[PDB]
Design a protein around this ligand. Structure first.
Ligand SMILES: [Mn+2]
Ligand SMILES: [Mn+2]
Lengths: 101, 101
């Protein structure tokens, strides 16, 4: 166990899970919270919405404001740049793991 | 493709490479710099010694001053905790990459 790594790793894991999920389908932030927990990653809003906003700014997520069932909500989906990023990032993890035996 | 990730990733990669090398054998700072370069991670002393010092503080590296061949030098080697950390960390990277395929 190594806490500096695990603390940084947490940020990577969240980030890549968002892109992965937002690639598969359109996602609400509320659901992302629960989905991430289900995968073993503790994220409370205050990290999530920020990183979501950052992800859009970086042009890897695109968002829609949308009124559905009398409810105003924002949905996110992965841009093609986001899809690229996910694969590049996944590969980088693979190369590192193999590099160190 | 994703420079925010790659910026953080670089720090992780360096950290793990040190542990990997310092696990296999005792290492001088100068040699770490060359080995890291060879692996495509440009690290200058202003970065390295801090990382090394932090790694020691986290109890994953141990350093020794010793006089060898009339030349006084400091060596670093991975503690058993460092060896553990490397494995746990490597595995964590593997599980992430696989679970976002
Ligand atoms: Mn899922
Ligand atoms: Mn080497």
């Amino acid at each position: 166990m190594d806490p500096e790594f695990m603390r940084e790793f947490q940020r990577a894991a969240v980030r890549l899970h968002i892109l992965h999920h937002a690639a598969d389908n359109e996602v609400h932030g509320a659901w992302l919270t629960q989905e991430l927990s289900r995968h073993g990653y503790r994220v409370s809003p205050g990290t999530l919405y920020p990183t979501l906003h950052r992800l859009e700014a970086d042009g890897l997520l695109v968002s829609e404001q949308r009124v559905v069932d009398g409810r105003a909500r924002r949905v996110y989906r992965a841009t093609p740049a986001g899809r690229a990023a996910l694969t590049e990032d996944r590969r980088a993890l693979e190369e590192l793991a193999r590099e160190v035996l």
